[PDB]
Structure formats: structure tokens, C-alpha cells
């Protein structure tokens, strides 16, 4: 029933202020005992608690982020915000918001998170190339095809197949940082060779930071 | 400041196994401990709160025990959907602190990868760059060796690898390897091969193509 969603700028320059918002439904932050917390996770690392705010406005902060955090709430808008001053590459992480009722907090519901990259580098849209299925993949068996999403910054890029109608056998690989400082990824799908053929395969690419959208038809 | 520790960083366990995940607090936390499950690409979920209380909607195979400093999360009979990173959290004193996390992998039967080679598209070549892609599809265990051969010459330093998280449907992994070289260097050679070494293969499998 309860839903939480984090939102942020995605890319922030070093020394600037990062602003994050947690938008929720299914509960009220005016309900006695209610609280909302912020937790972060740097790539390949664990969970770190950052801040918390109660229904009565009482704020709690992790001293490891000393004098850099400001947690606030707007109960009439079902929103909780987090402000992080003087950001550095050490603040690059996925930011999550979570809710609890009563003390101590049992974080009962969490949002999916928002990725924040702290970098001076400019936003760049990707080029999308088809990975055409081979002439001899497996005649009357399984064929593999995909899309190469190359030279973009920052993360993330959204990849779907046939506007979300094709999910089975899909593998969207985690992006790799190239020597140029730009990301590259491949998204593949294994399908029956007999449908190559008669069924249309389109990869839908959306790089939200640059608003670069590419839908590529992948044919043999 | 309460320090939380999880002695197991990561482990693999078979479906049906009894799994034990420990958490240790630097001082008495008076049962104010909760367990969280982080599945790849999904929101974190609360499993157990106040040491042993089961969160609504969580199956009974998940149980919590402990007192003072030592706590344990038990999965009585592991299911294939249980692969995730498990975190403990203390609520005894501010600042609230988490354990480092325990990554649990599903141990399944060995499966050889299905190997596919993709030449650089005609569209990409029109930009002076050529990317050759090798796909290793649905294999177990995670460990796999990819060797790029250009006109029988072994390549080094010009390739990058990416591995997916464990598959929710069959407990396998998939791997993508990209060989990067200029269009000028791409047109100089004819044979482009991807050699795969994996536990599921009796001998290494090679997938190749002729540019023309």
C-alpha cells in the first residue's frame, strides 16, 4: 500500500549543494510516532544512515556528515527533503528514504533510491548501435541479439525491449567506465531463431540526464 | 558510537540449506536490532524487527534470535529467490549503525554458457571506432575467462568486462566482453575470435567471424 520515491538532480558539481526529495503515499507524517529517514549506499559498499525526522519535527543526524546535512519535512505535501552542502566524489551514492513508526525505528518501507554522481564532467548522450543476430546462431533453436549503448555520462541509462513487452531472456549489463571517462553498456536478449524473422525487436534507450532517446530496430 | 559487524562478507548456499547470518554489536543493544534484505534492483525490505519479530508478508523460513551483543538471522530452508545482501541495524543509540552486509548467492548445478560473437555494426564503423562484443549467456559459477584473439594473436589491455547479478529465474550469471580498437586497426585484420574458459565446458569454446 505504502509507496516512497526519491528524486534528485542526478549530477552535481564538487563543492555545490545537493538537494534530495522523498515523496510518499499510504501514510501521513503527521501521524503520532511517524518518522522518515535518509540512508545512502556508495557503489559496491554497504548502507550508511544519514538523517531522520519525526512527526513532531525532531531532527537526528549522523556526525560522520558533520555540519553538511539539513533534513526537513512538508507534511501537507507528503514530502521529506535532504540538503547536503559542499559535496565531493565521496558523496557519490544511491540515496534512499525509508519510513518507520515509533522509537527505535524499524524501517518498514523503503524507496527504490536515486543515484547522485558528484563530478565536474559534462552530460553527454549515448550513440546506440544494433547487435544483429548471426546468420548461423542455431537453426531451429536459440538466437541472440542486442544493442550497444556507447559514450554517455552520467549514469543511469534506461533500456527496455519492445516498449516493455519483451522481458524474458533480457540481460542489460551494468555499465563500464571507459578510459575516456564515458560509460558504455550492452543489453541483449535470447529469442527463438524461428521468430527472427516474423517478430520485430526494438531496444528503447532513454538517457534521462541528457534527454537522448534512441529506439533501434535489431534485424538479421 | 556502536560498531556493528557481520563476520560473513559473502557466501554461497544451495536451495533447501539452513543459512545462518550473524551480527555482532560493540556493546549491549538490548534487543533493538532489525534485519534487512537488499535484492538486486529492488527496494530494501524489512524482514525481522526487535530481534525476533517477523515483518508482515515475510515468509516463516526467516527467523531472528539473539540478546546483548550477538544476533543471528536464520533462513531454515533456502529458496532460489533468497539471493540478496542481508544487513543488520541497531536502534539502541544514535547514530544508528548498520552491519557491513552479507551477500548470499544461490549455489546451483554447474551450467555452461551459451557463447555469441557480435561484429561492429556498419553504423558504428562510420564514426572511426569499432566495438566487438562477446556474450556469455546464463552460466554458473560466476567465474569465467574470456580471451580475445585477432588473427590468432592474443589481445591484452583493449577489452572490458561486465557481469550481471544472479538471475531470479534460473540462478545463473551472464557476461558481456567488449573489444575496443580503431576502424583503421579493425580493417587490417580478418579473424576476430572470443575464447571462453568455464567449469561447465570440457574444453574452451571459441566463437569467431570473418570481417568480409
Cell of B71: 544476533
A99 touches chain B (CB under 8 A): no
CA quadruple A131, A137, A140, A146: dihedral, nearest 10: -20
Q: Using a CB-CB distance cutoff of 8 angstroms, which residues of chain B are in contact with residue A183?
A: none
> Which residue has cell 580475445?
B148
Distance (Å, rounded) from C-alpha A167 to C-alpha B164?
A: 15
As beta bridge partners, residue B22 has B72
Q: Exposed, middle or buried by CB within 10 Å (0-12, 13-18, 19+), for A66?
A: exposed
Pairwise CB contact (< 8 Å): A148 & B121: yes
B142 touches chain A (CB under 8 A): no
Shortest distance, CA A77 to any CA of chain B (angstroms): 23
The answer to whether B49 and B58 are in contact (CB under 8 A) is: no
Backbone phi, psi, residue A203, to 5°: -95, 130
Q: Exposed, middle or buried by CB within 10 Å (0-12, 13-18, 19+), for A96?
A: buried
The answer to whether B15 and B106 are in contact (CB under 8 A) is: yes
- Helix or strand or coil: residue B47? strand
Pairwise CB contact (< 8 Å): A146 & B163: no
Interface test with B, best of A115, A131, A141, A155 (most B CBs within 10 A): A131
Backbone phi, psi, residue A210, to 5°: -110, -10
Rounded to the nearest angstrom, the gap between the alpha carbon of residue B175 and the centroid of all alpha carbons in its chain is 11
DSSP 8-class letter at A199? S
Cα dist from B147 to A53, B156, B178, B196, whole Å:
53, 9, 11, 7
The percent of chain A in helix, strand and coil, each rounded to the nearest 5, is 5, 50, 45
Pairwise CB contact (< 8 Å): A188 & B176: yes
The answer to whether A109 and A98 are in contact (CB under 8 A) is: yes
The answer to whether B58 and B47 are in contact (CB under 8 A) is: yes
Pairing of strands B114-118, B102-107: unpaired
Breaks in chain A, named by the residue before each, with C–N above 2.5 Å?
A: none
> Which residue has cell 560493540?
B26
- Helix or strand or coil: residue A201? coil
Q: Using a CB-CB distance cutoff of 8 angstroms, which residues of chain B are in contact with residue A174?
A: 162-164
In order of their start, the domains of chain B are: 1-108 (2.60.40.10), 109-211 (2.60.40.10)
- Helix or strand or coil: residue B188? helix
For A183, nearest residue in chain B (alpha carbons): B160
Q: Where in chain A is the domain with CATH 2.60.40.10?
A: 1-120, 121-219
| Residues in chain A, total | 220
A53 touches chain B (CB under 8 A): no
Query: Is the Cα dihedral A77, A82, A86, A88 positive or negative?
Result: negative
Technique employed here was X-ray
Helix boundaries (H) for B58-205: 122-125, 183-188
Pairing of strands B62-67, B53-54: unpaired
The answer to whether B163 and B175 are in contact (CB under 8 A) is: yes
DSSP 8-class letter at A87? -
Distance (Å, rounded) from C-alpha A103 to C-alpha A80?
A: 18
Closest CA to A99 of A61, A63, A52, A65: A52
Contacts (Cβ under 8 Å, ≥6 apart) of A39: A47, A48, A49, A50, A95, A96, A97, A98, A107, A110, B44
Q: What does B73-103 look like in DSSP terms, one character per residue?
A: EEESS--GGG-EEEEEEE-SSSSPEE---EE
Closest CA to B135 of B212, B207, B35: B207
Distance (Å, rounded) from C-alpha A159 to C-alpha B123?
A: 19
Q: Using a CB-CB distance cutoff of 8 angstroms, which residues of chain A are in contact with residue B99?
A: 46
Distance (Å, rounded) from C-alpha A100 to C-alpha B91?
A: 12
Shortest distance, CA B46 to any CA of chain A (angstroms): 6
Distance (Å, rounded) from C-alpha B202 to C-alpha B160?
A: 25
Pairwise CB contact (< 8 Å): B127 & A127: yes
The answer to whether B167 and B155 are in contact (CB under 8 A) is: no
Shortest distance, CA B97 to any CA of chain A (angstroms): 6
Cell of A33: 510516532
Find residues 4-63 of chain B whose CB sits inside 8 Å of chain A.
32, 34, 36, 38, 42-46, 49-50, 55
Find residues 180-219 of chain A whose CB sits inside 8 Å of chain B.
184-186, 188, 190
CATH number for the domain whose boundaries are A1-120? 2.60.40.10
For A187, nearest residue in chain B (alpha carbons): B176
> Which residue has cell 550508511?
A48
As beta bridge partners, residue B23 has B71
The answer to whether A53 and A72 are in contact (CB under 8 A) is: yes
Distance (Å, rounded) from C-alpha A169 to C-alpha A191?
A: 7
Cell of A92: 557519490
* Residue A97: half-sphere exposure toward Cβ, Cα within 13 Å: 26
How many Cβ atoms from other residues are within 10 Å of residue A174's Cβ?
15
The answer to whether A36 and A22 are in contact (CB under 8 A) is: yes
> Which residue has cell 538471475?
B167
Cis peptide before A40 (omega within 30 of 0): no
Cα dist from A19 to A68, A163, A180, B200, whole Å:
12, 31, 29, 49
As beta bridge partners, residue A144 has A190
Shortest distance, CA A133 to any CA of chain B (angstroms): 8
Distance (Å, rounded) from C-alpha A144 to C-alpha A161?
A: 13
CA quadruple A91, A93, A97, A98: dihedral, nearest 10: -110
In chain A, the N- to C-terminal Cα span, in Å, equals 45
Angle at B40 between CA B94 and CA B180, to 5 degrees: 120
- As assigned by CATH, the class of the A121-219 domain is mainly beta
Residue among B32, B92, B176 whose CB faces A173 most closely? B176
The answer to whether A169 and A128 are in contact (CB under 8 A) is: no
Contacts (Cβ under 8 Å, ≥6 apart) of A28: A34, A75, A78
Interface test with B, best of A173, A181, A185, A215 (most B CBs within 10 A): A173
Amino acid at each position: 500500500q505504502v509507496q516512497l520515491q526519491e528524486s534528485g538532480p542526478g549530477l552535481v558539481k564538487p563543492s555545490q549543494t545537493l538537494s534530495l526529495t522523498c515523496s510518499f503515499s499510504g501514510f501521513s507524517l503527521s501521524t503520532s510516532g511517524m518518522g522518515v529517514g535518509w540512508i545512502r549506499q556508495p557503489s559496491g559498499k554497504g548502507l550508511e544512515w544519514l538523517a531522520h525526522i519525526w512527526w513532531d519535527g525532531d531532527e537526528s543526524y549522523n556526525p560522520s556528515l558533520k555540519s553538511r546535512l539539513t533534513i526537513s519535512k512538508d507534511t501537507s505535501k507528503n514530502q521529506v527533503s535532504l540538503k547536503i552542502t559542499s559535496v565531493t566524489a565521496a558523496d557519490t551514492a544511491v540515496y534512499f528514504c525509508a519510513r518507520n513508526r515509533y522509537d527505535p525505528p524499524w524501517f518498514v518501507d523503503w524507496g527504490q533510491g536515486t543515484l547522485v554522481t558528484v563530478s565536474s564532467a559534462s552530460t553527454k548522450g549515448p550513440s546506440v548501435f544494433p547487435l544483429a543476430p548471426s546468420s548461423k546462431s542455431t537453426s531451429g533453436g536459440t538466437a541472440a541479439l542486442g544493442c550497444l549503448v556507447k559514450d554517455y555520462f552520467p549514469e543511469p541509462v534506461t533500456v527496455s525491449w519492445n516498449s516493455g513487452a519483451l522481458t524474458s531472456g533480457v540481460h542489460t549489463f551494468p555499465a563500464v567506465l571507459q578510459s575516456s571517462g564515458l560509460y558504455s553498456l550492452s543489453s541483449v536478449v535470447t529469442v527463438p531463431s524461428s521468430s527472427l524473422g516474423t517478430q520485430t525487436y526494438i531496444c528503447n534507450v532513454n538517457h534521462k540526464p541528457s534527454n537522448t532517446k534512441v529506439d533501434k530496430r535489431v534485424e538479421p | 558510537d556502536i560498531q556493528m559487524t557481520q563476520s560473513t562478507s559473502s557466501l554461497s548456499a544451495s536451495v533447501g540449506d539452513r543459512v545462518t547470518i550473524t551480527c555482532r554489536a560493540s556493546q549491549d543493544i538490548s534487543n533493538y536490532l532489525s534485519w534487512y534484505q537488499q535484492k538486486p534492483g529492488k527496494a530494501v525490505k524489512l524482514l525481522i524487527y526487535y530481534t525476533s519479530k517477523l515483518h508482515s508478508g515475510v515468509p516463516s523460513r526467516f527467523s531472528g534470535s539473539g540478546s546483548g551483543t550477538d544476533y543471528t538471522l536464520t533462513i531454515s530452508s533456502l529458496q532460489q529467490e533468497d539471493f540478496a545482501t542481508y544487513f543488520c541495524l541497531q536502534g539502541k543509540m544514535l547514530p544508528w549503525t548498520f552491519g557491513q552486509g552479507t551477500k548470499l548467492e544461490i549455489k546451483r548445478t554447474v551450467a555452461a554458457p551459451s557463447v555469441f560473437i557480435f561484429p561492429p555494426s556498419d553504423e558504428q564503423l562510420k564514426s572511426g571506432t569499432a566495438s566487438v562484443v562477446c556474450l556469455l549467456n546464463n552460466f554458473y559459477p560466476r567465474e569465467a575467462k574470456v580471451q580475445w584473439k585477432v588473427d590468432n594473436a592474443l589481445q591484452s589491455g583493449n577489452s572490458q568486462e561486465s557481469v550481471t547479478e544472479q538471475d531470479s529465474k534460473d540462478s545463473t550469471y551472464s557476461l558481456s566482453s567488449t573489444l575496443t580498437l580503431s576502424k583503421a586497426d579493425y580493417e587490417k585484420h580478418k579473424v576476430y575470435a572470443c575464447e571462453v574458459t568455464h567449469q561447465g565446458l570440457s574444453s574452451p569454446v571459441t566463437k569467431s567471424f570473418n570481417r568480409g
